[model samples]
Target: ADNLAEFHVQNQECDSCHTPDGELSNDSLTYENTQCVSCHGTLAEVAETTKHEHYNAHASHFPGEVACTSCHSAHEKSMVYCDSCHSFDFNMPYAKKWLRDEPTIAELAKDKSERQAALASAPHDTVDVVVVGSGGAGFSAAISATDSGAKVILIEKEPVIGGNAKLAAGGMNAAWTDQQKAKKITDSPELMFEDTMKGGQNINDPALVKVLSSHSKDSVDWMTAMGADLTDVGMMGGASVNRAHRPTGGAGVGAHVVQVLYDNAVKRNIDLRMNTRGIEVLKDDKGTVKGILVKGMYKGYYWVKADAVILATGGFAKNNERVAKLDPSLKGFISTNQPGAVGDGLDVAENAGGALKDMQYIQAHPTLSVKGGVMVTEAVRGNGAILVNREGKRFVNEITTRDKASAAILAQTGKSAYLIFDDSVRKSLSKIDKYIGLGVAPTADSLVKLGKMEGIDGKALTETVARYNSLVSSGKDTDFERPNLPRALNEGNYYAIEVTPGVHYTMGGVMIDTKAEVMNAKKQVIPGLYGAGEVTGGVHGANRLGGNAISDIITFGRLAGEEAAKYS
Candidate 1:
């Protein structure tokens, strides 16, 4: 068979795999994918048929079932969505070569007149809601909108979904969850709100902070209801309790959360289109948002009219040019953000009269591997690891807020510090194994040997470890007043990985109101416009906590979707 259509039509007519009337899918090929699963079985069942040695394409890192049309297509070349982040060249039975010459933001903007003409002419498509970006917040909004009786279309500029949310390694913060209760920990929304407000220096929007704190448990419960593994509760910096929820063994939580969101969005049959960039947010003459002008990788520029548009495009941490322009102090800092986290929605929303807020607040994560730029999760420090300078002297508290830790590391000798841990700490956090496998963590049988291996003063390192162990035994950090000393670093083999501060989260973007509605410069709500996640600002204030990013996106993303649906 030349194509899937030819192969399938041999058994029956168009209705055999499509709608009964033989027209294309009105949304995401949800019905067609359902037909494929009905005949071919689930992804796991189909995965058992393949004999690939390197990897199993069907058994993806993303949990649960995925839409079959995400990779397979009848009318176009089949694509492997995983290839966006990896280079697995599995030979499929009927796959055409995947090609790409996608346009940049500038290239798309070059045809402004064309887009304007299309916008004035007629909408190529319409929906009750149009969401830009497919990270955690984007998927959340899409799923919630559809559930709230709104037809939604989600767009991502990258070929793959899960923008920075895929790179989130730590976990999400929420107070008063079953996970916390099981451990006999007491917490409340009031404490969470106070901690978040203080962590951001009280400059955060009080109303937005209250919403995040109040709905955080519900967000965690929401994920758990959808089969997410957030039973493991731990601590992050700037928190009064062990409120950070994650997978068992402290595995990376962002990818898991994104997987859960993506899986649910698929179940809801959201019309998600990758490689589609929203170049502008279209507005009617009354200054109310009407739709989005998108430039598709394959379809070029077109207009997508909608009753409401949600900006979930994430932040510009990876856009070094933008980052430098906004805050010159971080001009040369490397970023841990995904390539798609360029704040495109900021421009889109701002162009439509939406205001930008907290644009100067950029976060520099403290533990990016200096050589590989791989992030060592905050869970490592929270679980019981220490940071030492070249002289093998302990510096700032290991579990301090990200901004303070980053600054402390930058002030250290060589502008970098070593994250020292023992086998006990390594075994406690599952994400450590990945860093060790990446060759960033050098190991030795003893603290002195570990120090020598990392070019630090061995004698000073051993003495430093002894003093730290003494303090841990006494239940006091005399040198730095460090909090949450779970254990000493004297157990088993020791490992050292050099780390430096790198651009992590953009603390600001387009401004949004308490209802997740986009706001104008005059602080008035922009009708028909909504914003969520990192694309909007004022939630984190001047700085963000370690686990609060996930909390903000999911909580506000749901709110944005529900409110947008009601307006629609």
Candidate 2:
């Protein structure tokens, strides 16, 4: 009665015919222990206890076969799916449920009348603001515009909402915090500006840097106000001070930001369209953008006339064919960007008389999966991991910024390096092993054994481990002076995952003034055309600092939205 026997007895009435194999009659046993308790009891208990079960309940149909493990991970415990699954094309419907908590199919079907009515009444033309791209920039702009009491429309070329924002580690650079005060970190907006300019090698417009530096704190506050749980722990990444604010974990932080924005947009009745590509900008006689030409997967060549258009299309990292043509050195580089970042915005803007600037500069992330371009978060290095070469030799200084580390890695022979860590490192890092289908860990052990590492002998790996352990035990990294060495490589089954230079972000695009207005080669604003986020260049000069890129998108995206709302 306490086990499967009781379950069989209650659900199935078979006494005389109760055999060992056929104890439960097929017709009488409608809900057996294997099916009922398997789903409604133990499985249900496990599901109810998890954030994913609560967050992504839409995935319950594939119980066990594809249940929680299909997307959300129990080990990493991300409330969202973007962290575990970086590829936007893979399992995005599952991700949407986690982020948006969308209604189930049954519930949606029940609301068909309401949905049809709303769709019928919705205006096909005449919107207050139109935002192109569903990346952080576009979504952030939509949130800003909607918050300011304007009708906003967001168009994304991809089938999903998250662009490269889903692929980002979700770090932002913001100065002036009590945390900085606790660490005796005296960071001013001016100094932050200087560091940004210097990092870009003075290629960035000073006026734009001044605007971003001054308004960044407010932007961070705005994100937090929108329900983002951003951490105050400042991460140093060759910036002027400890102002880089990351989420409690990394990886899917951008996804969370996008989710908050998307959720807010939806709640405000904003028209968010996925699988819609911005084909061209509709310009008036004076060369001002009047609207946007969009082509949907189902609906072709629809002209969306808006009072104002905000171009927030992201960078060109995934557009390798275009990027390589611009920068010959980036011939065969892998990309950590979303595939939707194919420079569609750049192409559209350039065709509308917008001048292109700094199109050759690209950021090469130093620590990415050498085999398939999966990113090992920079937080790994921030938490005392080191980069080693093919010979199992430590190459770059671990304490350096990600840009410097990438430069060193690229400078090494073969343009590759290996990230070495142990089980302790794996446990301490965030979103390391979230690959559901690939069955690989973000840790070195699983990745190394998975045949992703090369160029090191057994003896060299052992010696490297010994040397690193000695340094970590003494609470001092003699080789790199890495401040925080929580654990050493002494943990059993050390790992070494190979890394290579991957084209991460484009540092250039359409020329835009400080007001986010698109400009031509003669330094003249193209009347009504405006750009925000990565689509507008001059924020990142020669190289972009690690956490500053996301900041640029949100900060300027809001500015562009508010400005466009006024124009409308």
Candidate 3:
């Protein structure tokens, strides 16, 4: 409320806006969200009344489908809903200016001086489960643990919740789902397992891969039951069929699920704490993890005790120091990761004697702005965009795995390429205008115009599009042998997102068994220590598929929660 007063909506009415009774607005804690529609009316109703840019309610309702508390606290003051998944300028307020992704370190101080002081102190409070991170995995873990009748506390290092998962721009991989069946597309978990192993180059542990592929559809089905919209499905890179479950529109559908999971955790009465960074995995004399030493908002320490600890702190792709330690060549490269994915939990787990594996399988995602690394979404290519080198020549098939596409970019003369598409492709992207508004998508009237605008050779770009359009007409991708060519590139305004590789994910992390138990180097489960999500890896191996992260986290996060809840 205090951070972004300029963004607070100027309005009147107490009972009408907050509730029939101001005291009745809150449900023991803060204002309950169920009565949100009763006060403000439905989004569509307000769209007719407000008729303002602030009333762009249909486009994700500001934060997500429903998070009334995100905007109006209802009790006392308002909150900045944008901070749920954005880097809002504290002093500079702009209209509809959201941080596309974790842009750079210029926003705040990178040092952890206060955090360093907090971890040195002892925490005595104990709960049943201590869930680290507030992204997809942590939320699910907290909810599942609470569902299993375990007291849980979820800690987040970021100022707000929703890590990179909030900014994710892909779908969830599943099979034999209602969406696929309605589309008359046939797929099986057996088939998906094959695709996953093949895509991961078979280096992934078969046990971990098995659990991922088998129960992927369960996670989708479960989330759908929780009121998430996963009706639309698509075929991303490394997939054999259209089994990646997504929301109706936009590639960053992860935000929708992030809200859903958080809502579910809250509904189940899980303790959710933000701005608390877990620094140490505390264990008893028997070497069983009992809790974590965390840094709260102030320069104080929190001894958060729990019978079982779940490490959902996500990956370290955003940390240059961690990136360099794993692979020196990838140091200082651009990343789409959020601020708190610094591998501190990974080190904490290891220091507690948990085993580590595949410490080098970092992935550079294929698509992003070549200039500033803002994501173009894998859905761009999933919707039939083609890639071209700096010489304006098509080099690789457009729908290969991210590893191959990123490798192709790395082999390029400038370590970058141009992701070119026609107006039809642009029209198909639900979030295209927002990106274009954010200055990530550059527009051109024609192929020659695009080349001139992006500084590529006009003549070669014209030839490239000419050949691509010919392939589309013939219904065959003869140049690079892409399986399908949905539409041609010979219509309307030509569009190109300068494409480059960025550290997208880390396929390697703390070693874990199929049960999501953190295992020591002795190949035994570390008692009371669990890990899920990106922090505990070996799920994707050397390469990650386009739409598998969500499914992986939800699946394993549920298992980890259930398992840790069973700890006696």
Candidate 4:
């Protein structure tokens, strides 16, 4: 009876979506048929049958691409992976059963009285807070927690502690600074908030942004207290004023900030653990977190009870499989983040009944060469550079949001862009020259000759400059609406930097309030679970500005730690 297609709808059991149970099926998984559409119908049909087309899950539209395995898994725990990135509310009757059906940490302790007694007993390692990732936010959380005389444990999955934040080339965005005052760049927290919201497509929560901008100076002061040199302030993308604060004496902002935080934590003797991977977040049946299940390279797997757990696990840009499943278009684009950003912390949170938000808002960047994913800096464009496609045409307003311009690059025939500029901004910019010396890529001289020497197109390239020159003369860009036209051209020695959409950052993550408490799928706080940095969402909505990543990390990192310590 189960063999028949009618049995699937009749029983609605495991065989409902699995058909021949999928395990026994000899065919490839991509061979799509009735296993999914038996009731789900075609993409267009599902769109019609669904409550609204706003869901955007057109079954037939991505027939071969959005495979059934992308969402539902029978042998494995059935999870609607679409929920990781999309906000579309879905009813997966076949998959939901297993999704929520998991043994709680309290349930695992079958002997309730014995477990309760054991909880009262001495623990192997107990702390007021447990931080899962050792990035910029992780360090900030540790420092903040320790500031309140709270014991904190810092865990790192990699052999080396620093995450993507440690390798960042840019700096943080803050307002009302001596640097801004020196340059006479009039700025306020309200202006920072407005710029952040504008750059993020107004997707970032005003509550979160308010907290971030309100404490911008405090974050800088926090770093300065740790011996961080944030005296040098430069301009980055999507800012009306100069507010990016950089370390004056360091390799880069990323390394310097990490070193300062690391040194501060070391002085405080913070319990920093390396090669430790968090398997799952332990929680009671009542939806309150207990601790985290972690396996160390040396210590092995064990439970560490804590007042709260903070997930600073970086974004999942390096995990192509997950990103492809979320937004199929991002499969081929290169990411700027390191390979360690596999998003393990989010996995632990989800299994512990935590919610995910905006996992699909991945941002791309430029100046990362073909290999090794090296970042030049945001100061390049901020120093008066222009982006040109292979057609040698200015596709977007250079100073606009990265998302708006990044999309323009991807929409091109080859999905790449070239940063065209003269030596006018050369003295101000030295990173590009360093890369050119190290054999990253060569620069072109003269726009018409740049086109002539290159293989794209000469006539069209000449016309592109002519049009840009016309826009410069009229002081108006009717084509793409560029506000400030750089009073320069490629008539002299020109540099064409390879600027493609390298996967830089992910704006979507676990949903959290300004307090940094992790929320569940039902939109309620998961008690004792906190998240900050790239692991949580809402600070940056759709697009992240040049310096906003640092602001997002440190602000929420401190907030999460401070708030977590307040929890009983």
Q: Please report the candidate that would top TM-score against the real structure.
A: 1
Ten residues in sequence with the least summed lDDT for candidate 1: 96-105
Model 3, global lDDT: 0.75
Candidate 1 Cα errors over 4 Å, as ranges:
1-107
> Judged by lDDT, which candidate is best?
1
TM-score of every candidate: 0.85, 0.74, 0.81, 0.73
Cα lDDT tens digits, model 1, 1-568, are 8777788788777877877776645334557778988889989899999746546778755543466776787765676666544446587757755543444555677787787677777888889999888888988899888999999999987656788887777789998888899978899999999999999998899999999999999999988998789887878887888889899988889889988888888788788886678888878889888888887755667888999999899988878888999889898887877656776678788888899989999988999998667677888888889999999999899888888999999999999999999999998889888788657898999877887778898889999989999999999999998878888887789999899988889889888988999989999999999999998899999989999999999998988999999999
Which candidate, 1 or 2, has the higher lDDT?
A: 1
For residue 359, what is the lDDT in candidate 2? 85
Ranked candidates, highest lDDT first: 1, 3, 4, 2
293 in model 1: Cα distance from truth in Å?
1.4
In the predicted model 4, the residue pairs found to clash are: 43-59, 43-60, 334-503, 335-503, 336-503, 358-508
Candidate number with the higher lDDT (1 or 3): 1
Off by over 4 Å in 3: 1-124
Alpha-carbon lDDT, every model? 0.84, 0.67, 0.75, 0.71
Query: Per-residue alpha-carbon lDDT of model 4 for 183-282, expressed as tens digits?
Result: 6678999999999999988888889889989999889888887788887676778888778887652125776788788888888988887657666677
